[PDB]
Scaffold this active site. Structure first.
Site, PDB file in Angstrom:
ATOM      1  N   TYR A   1     -48.576   7.248   6.049  1.00 27.57           N
ATOM      2  CA  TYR A   1     -48.992   7.980   4.865  1.00 27.57           C
ATOM      3  C   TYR A   1     -47.870   8.917   4.448  1.00 27.57           C
ATOM      4  CZ  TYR A   1     -49.794  11.907   7.982  1.00 27.57           C
ATOM      5  OH  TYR A   1     -49.638  12.914   8.902  1.00 27.57           O
TER       6      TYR A   1
ATOM      7  N   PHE B   1     -34.867  15.791  12.653  1.00 26.98           N
ATOM      8  CA  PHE B   1     -34.124  14.698  12.041  1.00 26.98           C
ATOM      9  C   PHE B   1     -33.538  13.784  13.110  1.00 26.98           C
ATOM     10  CE2 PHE B   1     -30.354  12.893   9.889  1.00 26.98           C
ATOM     11  CZ  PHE B   1     -31.014  12.249   8.870  1.00 26.98           C
TER      12      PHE B   1
ATOM     13  N   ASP C   1     -49.548   2.448  17.513  1.00 24.63           N
ATOM     14  CA  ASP C   1     -48.671   1.980  16.442  1.00 24.63           C
ATOM     15  C   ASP C   1     -47.235   1.866  16.934  1.00 24.63           C
ATOM     16  OD1 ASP C   1     -48.805   1.000  13.781  1.00 24.63           O
ATOM     17  OD2 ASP C   1     -47.744   2.784  13.067  1.00 24.63           O
TER      18      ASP C   1
HETATM   19  C1  LIG Z   1     -32.534   9.079   8.930  1.00 28.34           C
HETATM   20  C2  LIG Z   1     -33.491   7.966   9.266  1.00 28.34           C
HETATM   21  C3  LIG Z   1     -33.218   6.657   8.884  1.00 28.34           C
HETATM   22  C4  LIG Z   1     -34.087   5.639   9.196  1.00 28.34           C
HETATM   23  S1  LIG Z   1     -33.722   3.978   8.704  1.00 28.34           S
HETATM   24  O1  LIG Z   1     -32.457   3.975   8.020  1.00 28.34           O
HETATM   25  O2  LIG Z   1     -33.887   3.113   9.840  1.00 28.34           O
HETATM   26  C5  LIG Z   1     -34.994   3.621   7.533  1.00 28.34           C
HETATM   27  C6  LIG Z   1     -34.549   3.963   6.109  1.00 28.34           C
HETATM   28  C7  LIG Z   1     -34.993   2.556   5.653  1.00 28.34           C
HETATM   29  C8  LIG Z   1     -36.331   2.532   4.910  1.00 28.34           C
HETATM   30  C9  LIG Z   1     -36.408   1.257   4.098  1.00 28.34           C
HETATM   31  N1  LIG Z   1     -35.435   1.260   3.007  1.00 28.34           N
HETATM   32  C10 LIG Z   1     -35.067  -0.100   2.621  1.00 28.34           C
HETATM   33  C11 LIG Z   1     -35.201  -0.391   1.147  1.00 28.34           C
HETATM   34  C12 LIG Z   1     -35.542  -1.852   0.938  1.00 28.34           C
HETATM   35  C13 LIG Z   1     -35.918  -2.103  -0.506  1.00 28.34           C
HETATM   36  N2  LIG Z   1     -37.178  -1.431  -0.793  1.00 28.34           N
HETATM   37  C14 LIG Z   1     -38.020  -2.040  -1.695  1.00 28.34           C
HETATM   38  C15 LIG Z   1     -39.366  -1.696  -1.819  1.00 28.34           C
HETATM   39  C16 LIG Z   1     -40.198  -2.341  -2.704  1.00 28.34           C
HETATM   40  C17 LIG Z   1     -39.675  -3.374  -3.476  1.00 28.34           C
HETATM   41  C18 LIG Z   1     -38.324  -3.741  -3.350  1.00 28.34           C
HETATM   42  C19 LIG Z   1     -37.502  -3.076  -2.457  1.00 28.34           C
HETATM   43  F1  LIG Z   1     -36.204  -3.411  -2.318  1.00 28.34           F
HETATM   44  N3  LIG Z   1     -38.091  -4.781  -4.228  1.00 28.34           N
HETATM   45  C20 LIG Z   1     -36.835  -5.470  -4.423  1.00 28.34           C
HETATM   46  C21 LIG Z   1     -39.255  -5.079  -4.890  1.00 28.34           C
HETATM   47  O3  LIG Z   1     -39.405  -5.942  -5.736  1.00 28.34           O
HETATM   48  N4  LIG Z   1     -40.226  -4.210  -4.436  1.00 28.34           N
HETATM   49  C22 LIG Z   1     -41.607  -4.228  -4.924  1.00 28.34           C
HETATM   50  C23 LIG Z   1     -42.256  -2.851  -4.874  1.00 28.34           C
HETATM   51  C24 LIG Z   1     -43.749  -2.895  -5.140  1.00 28.34           C
HETATM   52  C25 LIG Z   1     -44.468  -3.964  -4.386  1.00 28.34           C
HETATM   53  O4  LIG Z   1     -45.647  -3.894  -4.095  1.00 28.34           O
HETATM   54  N5  LIG Z   1     -43.742  -5.073  -4.014  1.00 28.34           N
HETATM   55  C26 LIG Z   1     -42.386  -5.239  -4.129  1.00 28.34           C
HETATM   56  O5  LIG Z   1     -41.843  -6.189  -3.605  1.00 28.34           O
HETATM   57  C27 LIG Z   1     -37.463  -0.229  -0.009  1.00 28.34           C
HETATM   58  C28 LIG Z   1     -36.187   0.491   0.397  1.00 28.34           C
HETATM   59  C29 LIG Z   1     -34.262   2.045   3.381  1.00 28.34           C
HETATM   60  C30 LIG Z   1     -33.927   1.823   4.838  1.00 28.34           C
HETATM   61  C31 LIG Z   1     -35.082   2.143   7.141  1.00 28.34           C
HETATM   62  C32 LIG Z   1     -35.255   5.905   9.894  1.00 28.34           C
HETATM   63  C33 LIG Z   1     -35.537   7.188  10.280  1.00 28.34           C
HETATM   64  C34 LIG Z   1     -34.664   8.226   9.972  1.00 28.34           C
HETATM   65  N6  LIG Z   1     -34.924   9.555  10.362  1.00 28.34           N
HETATM   66  C35 LIG Z   1     -36.093  10.187  10.618  1.00 28.34           C
HETATM   67  N7  LIG Z   1     -36.005  11.427  11.125  1.00 28.34           N
HETATM   68  C36 LIG Z   1     -37.122  12.065  11.376  1.00 28.34           C
HETATM   69  C37 LIG Z   1     -38.368  11.497  11.134  1.00 28.34           C
HETATM   70  C38 LIG Z   1     -39.613  12.120  11.380  1.00 28.34           C
HETATM   71  C39 LIG Z   1     -40.765  11.480  11.110  1.00 28.34           C
HETATM   72  C40 LIG Z   1     -40.752  10.159  10.569  1.00 28.34           C
HETATM   73  O6  LIG Z   1     -41.798   9.558  10.315  1.00 28.34           O
HETATM   74  N8  LIG Z   1     -39.533   9.540  10.321  1.00 28.34           N
HETATM   75  C41 LIG Z   1     -39.479   8.175   9.774  1.00 28.34           C
HETATM   76  C42 LIG Z   1     -40.234   7.950   8.464  1.00 28.34           C
HETATM   77  C43 LIG Z   1     -40.414   6.448   8.383  1.00 28.34           C
HETATM   78  C44 LIG Z   1     -40.310   5.916   9.768  1.00 28.34           C
HETATM   79  C45 LIG Z   1     -40.083   7.103  10.682  1.00 28.34           C
HETATM   80  C46 LIG Z   1     -38.350  10.196  10.601  1.00 28.34           C
HETATM   81  N9  LIG Z   1     -37.228   9.544  10.341  1.00 28.34           N
END
Ligand SMILES: Cc1cc(S(=O)(=O)C2CC3(CCN(CC4CCN(c5ccc6c(c5F)n(C)c(=O)n6[C@@H]5CCC(=O)NC5=O)CC4)CC3)C2)ccc1Nc1ncc2ccc(=O)n(C3CCCC3)c2n1
Ligand SMILES: [Zn+2]
Lengths: 298, 276, 322
Positions: free
Chosen positions: A15, A82, A127
């Site tokens: 969420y 972070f 999870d």
């Molecule tokens: C620093 C750090 C880095 C990474 S990382 O780099 O690994 C990560 C970044 C990442 C997340 C994913 N995007 C990839 C992209 C891919 C393309 N896209 C996308 C989406 C929809 C698309 C689409 C797309 F292209 N297209 C072409 C479409 O048409 N649609 C439509 C849309 C509608 C639909 O319905 N349908 C479709 O298809 C989404 C973005 C970036 C890369 C991977 C991980 C963690 C951290 N740090 C950190 N620190 C502290 C915390 C604390 C708490 C906490 O929870 N977290 C995290 C939060 C989440 C997990 C844990 C923390 N995290």
């Protein structure tokens, strides 16, 4: 919340939305999970309350810290710590040569500790997937996204049925077991362990029955000698095909004879017999464990 | 001292689990005098509210843990306030029950259902505001060990066959609901907050058991629960004279879980006899 | 089956953000006048009046135009480019910005806008502004009001998709109902220009009720062999109907038809809930099994007590009705 400055979007978890933000006072990078309260019909979502309550009782070096909770009109912010990546992206970035064995061992002997800490507090993560295990450049792996977690009482009762992502679901959950417990998490870790050694998902099924059948193919079809009670389980059908326990020397080729044993115990059918988090930390596999530093690409 | 009621646990280490439980017993504070801050309210107004919250829990088949979470949230939030008027009691209680239901139950009732049971005195938007107010005043510490969570542990330890097996329910449904009935009439008295929740559960268990079973299942010594037993005496006598109820059935609830659903029967009539 | 999804969510475009301004004005340039209209440089959609067209603008000139076009009227001329995609647009629709928002946070312009098509026009000419901006000289087409039976007959099938609450949707006026229906047919573009260049509502309904029982299967376009879906599996998760327009984080606009079951598709990657067009559902990229042409997504439930545990959204740009 005027003190934090956003720098980039990280992604979306169970969420809310996660952003990278730098604290203007101490100049320390922090993650920020934002929840738009106004869109939420039933006030603060139950997942948010459960997390914030659980994460304020769990203070371990292997669980992402909940630095703060802030409420600015129609918006709830959780300030985490972070971390530089997620195991999934690391595995993809190292999908040619593979994660070195000492790093795999250290990462497994850092999720088991956090999992044991959670279980001693009577908390079920439920999870455990690669996108929820965050790694930093110092060589530490930490659990995250406790939104789907639950505190299980003593004794347990019937909790939410379909839980955990399909790829990392225990067979007892698939077969509609009435009571589930810590064992499920262990299964997830095993599925993750074999993913790090092999670099690809162990049981990539697209539907419930497909995942169940892949599990049966890899590990055999359970009978009453290996899993007393399957043949009475709600979702068990006698028409299941008969498969025979593919050897682990072909399932995870690169693992030794102790890693293989640990994986087999982690992937036990019977939840009662499945190895526990603390019983795995005493395994010989974790006898020469170290803390190597990964070379992250950003 | 509280030695070690728990058996050898496989999923974790018994010492660490018991230490964490005992530290929970010490981190969530309760004050029996939290009503002297609010000069307009009186103890009877608390019972009337808590009794009402039981009734609602019965209407929607909410677990006992939900009601006791609501009671803990109420008695902790109200200890952090000042000069609360009786008109706001119902809103605070309903918001606490909403929070507890969201926390505990698989399919909590929707917000409009909680608003409806209030008969228009509280609306959905009021409940949403008060829930955030409560979760802030409590500092987001919404995971206590309630009075019934301790009874569950005590009954599991009392009825054990193959060692371990502490997580799978195994105990009679008729003895658990008799003690939980004495713990709902004792909870309506504000002096119940004087003793730790574990001691309250142990005292009820003893009142419906022997002085040896309680010590086997809880680890308390006689001197520890002596005051609680003495105070519970007149609340146990009334229940004994009235006669324990039976394990009622509920629609949509398995026959092995009917003991985990709150059952409001009548508490303001027995409470005034006990306090007599 | 039953859908406790609150189908009003898809039309709200919650994925586009939170802080959005909600202009509540209107404008309707004369029913027959030569007008000069600014165009969006990249939008290739063939917009039908009454449709919601989300947009995520990054280009500096696009942002400048929207910002300066926000004050003085809010109409931009979305051309319906012919099969010859580059220029060669003879007709089009005007859109009016009804939800505008800027976001300089993260140090990037990114303007998120939501506009709804209003009028139809023939492009008399196409001049170029001093900054890569097309000013289209367009004469507004007339609405030829000249019927009830056709509307009820169309409703007879509009109820099978997403059993309708009542006549609240599908406005009584023939033009509005005809345009709303036309916005939902999974037909391709060449038939979409003809449906747009119809005119009186009667021939439009007779071309819509025409292509509602004749077409048999939606199949892969880039290979033409796979049989993806059929109308028996079609259903609408949004008030707008089975099909609608959404935007991906990169600004591209997709017309995703919602269906219950599709075949010959294989999934790539793992389910994600990022930027999900349908709140509470996760999407997995879907490609056909014979030429690996990105065809759509498979949405699956992610929260508790969700009615449709799985459906498909197929992008209309890769489907050839047959
Ligand atoms: C620093 C750090 C880095 C990474 S990382 O780099 O690994 C990560 C970044 C990442 C997340 C994913 N995007 C990839 C992209 C891919 C393309 N896209 C996308 C989406 C929809 C698309 C689409 C797309 F292209 N297209 C072409 C479409 O048409 N649609 C439509 C849309 C509608 C639909 O319905 N349908 C479709 O298809 C989404 C973005 C970036 C890369 C991977 C991980 C963690 C951290 N740090 C950190 N620190 C502290 C915390 C604390 C708490 C906490 O929870 N977290 C995290 C939060 C989440 C997990 C844990 C923390 N995290
Ligand atoms: Zn194809």
């Amino acid at each position: 919340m005027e003190n934090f400055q956003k720098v980039e979007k990280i992604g979306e978890g169970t969420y809310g939305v996660v952003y990278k933000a730098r604290n203007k006072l101490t100049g320390e990078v922090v993650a920020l999970k934002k929840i738009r309260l106004d869109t939420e019909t039933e006030g603060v979502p139950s997942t948010a309350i459960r997390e914030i309550s659980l994460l304020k009782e769990l203070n371990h070096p292997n669980i992402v810290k909940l630095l703060d909770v802030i409420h600015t009109e129609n918006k709830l912010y959780l300030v985490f710590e972070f971390l530089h990546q997620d195991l999934k992206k690391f595995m993809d970035a190292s999908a040619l040569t593979g994660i070195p064995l000492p790093l795999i061992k250290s990462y497994l002997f850092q999720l088991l500790q956090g999992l044991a800490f959670c279980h001693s507090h009577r908390v079920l993560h439920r999870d455990l997937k690669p996108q929820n295990l965050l790694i930093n450049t110092e060589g530490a792996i930490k659990l995250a996204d406790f939104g789907l977690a639950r505190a299980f009482g003593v004794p347990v009762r019937t909790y939410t049925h379909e839980v955990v992502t399909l790829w990392y679901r225990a067979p007892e959950i698939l077969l509609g077991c009435k009571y589930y417990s810590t064992a499920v998490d262990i299964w997830s870790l095993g599925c993750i362990f074999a993913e790090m050694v092999t670099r690809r998902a162990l049981f990539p099924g697209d539907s419930e029955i497909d995942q169940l059948f892949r599990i049966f193919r890899t590990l055999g079809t359970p009978d009453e000698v290996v899993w007393p009670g399957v043949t009475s389980m709600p979702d068990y059908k006698p028409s299941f095909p008969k498969w025979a326990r593919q050897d682990f020397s072909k399932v995870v080729p690169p693992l030794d004879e102790d890693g293989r044993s640990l994986l087999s115990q982690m992937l036990h059918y019977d939840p009662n017999k499945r190895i526990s988090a603390k019983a795995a930390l005493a395994h010989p596999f974790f006898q020469d464990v170290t803390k190597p530093v990964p070379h992250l690409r950003l | 001292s509280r030695g070690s009621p728990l058996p050898v646990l496989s999923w974790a280490n018994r010492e660490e689990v018991w230490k964490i439980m005992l530290n929970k017993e010490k981190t969530y504070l309760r004050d029996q005098h939290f009503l002297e801050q609010h000069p307009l309210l009186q103890p009877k107004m608390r019972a009337i509210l808590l009794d009402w919250l039981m009734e609602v829990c019965e209407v929607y088949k909410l677990h006992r843990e939900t009601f006791y979470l609501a009671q803990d949230f109420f008695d902790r939030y109200m200890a952090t306030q000042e000069n609360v008027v009786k008109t706001l009691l119902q809103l605070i209680g309903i918001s606490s029950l909403f929070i507890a239901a969201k926390l505990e139950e698989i399919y909590p009732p929707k917000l409009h259902q909680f608003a409806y049971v209030t008969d228009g005195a509280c609306s959905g938007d009021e409940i949403l505001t008060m829930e955030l107010m409560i979760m802030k005043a409590l500092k987001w510490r919404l995971s206590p060990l309630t009075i019934v969570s301790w009874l569950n542990v005590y009954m599991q330890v009392a009825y054990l066959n193959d060692l371990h097996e502490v997580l799978l329910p195994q105990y009679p449904q008729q003895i658990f609901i008799q003690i939980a009935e004495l713990l709902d009439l004792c909870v309506l008295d504000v002096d119940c907050l004087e003793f730790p929740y574990g001691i309250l559960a142990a005292s009820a268990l003893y009142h419906f058991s022997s002085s040896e079973l309680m010590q086997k299942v809880s680890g308390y010594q006689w001197c520890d629960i002596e005051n609680c037993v003495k105070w519970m005496v007149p609340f146990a006598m009334v229940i004994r004279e009235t006669g324990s109820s039976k394990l009622k059935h509920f629609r949509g609830v398995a026959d092995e879980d009917a003991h985990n659903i709150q059952t409001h029967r009548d508490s303001l009539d027995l409470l005034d006899k006990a306090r007599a | 089956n039953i859908i406790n999804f609150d189908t009003s969510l898809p039309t709200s475009h919650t994925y586009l953000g939170a802080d959005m301004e909600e202009f509540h004005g209107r404008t309707l340039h004369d029913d027959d006048s030569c007008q000069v209209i600014p165009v969006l440089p990249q939008v290739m959609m063939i917009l039908i009046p009454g449709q919601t067209l989300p947009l995520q603008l990054f280009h500096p000139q696009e942002v400048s135009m929207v910002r300066n076009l926000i004050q003085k009227d809010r109409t931009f001329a979305v051309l319906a480019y012919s099969n010859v995609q580059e220029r060669e647009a003879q007709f089009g629709t005007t859109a009016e910005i009804y939800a505008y928002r800027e976001e300089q946070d993260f140090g990037i312009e990114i303007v998120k806008v939501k506009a709804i098509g209003r009028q139809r026009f023939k492009v008399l000419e196409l001049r170029t502004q001093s900054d890569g901006i097309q000013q289209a000289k367009v004469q507004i087409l007339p609405e030829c009001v000249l019927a009830e039976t056709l509307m009820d007959r169309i409703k007879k099938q509009l109820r099978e998709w997403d059993e309708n609450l009542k006549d609240d949707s599908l406005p009584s006026n023939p033009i509005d109902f005809s345009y709303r229906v036309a916005a939902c047919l999974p037909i391709d573009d060449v038939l979409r220009i003809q449906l747009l260049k119809i005119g009186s509502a009667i021939q439009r309904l007779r071309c819509e009720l025409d292509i509602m029982n004749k077409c048999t299967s939606l199949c892969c376009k880039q290979c033409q062999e796979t049989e993806i879906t059929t109308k028996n599996e079609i259903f609408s998760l949004s008030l707008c109907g089975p099909m609608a327009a959404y935007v991906n984080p990169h600004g591209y606009v997709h017309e995703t038809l919602t269906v219950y079951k599709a075949c010959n598709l294989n999934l790539i990657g793992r389910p994600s809930t990022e930027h999900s067009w349908f709140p509470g559902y996760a999407w997995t990229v879907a490609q056909c099994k014979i030429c690996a042409s990105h065809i759509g997504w498979k949405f699956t439930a992610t929260k508790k007590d969700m009615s449709p545990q799985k459906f498909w959204g197929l992008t209309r740009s890769a489907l050839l009705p047959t």
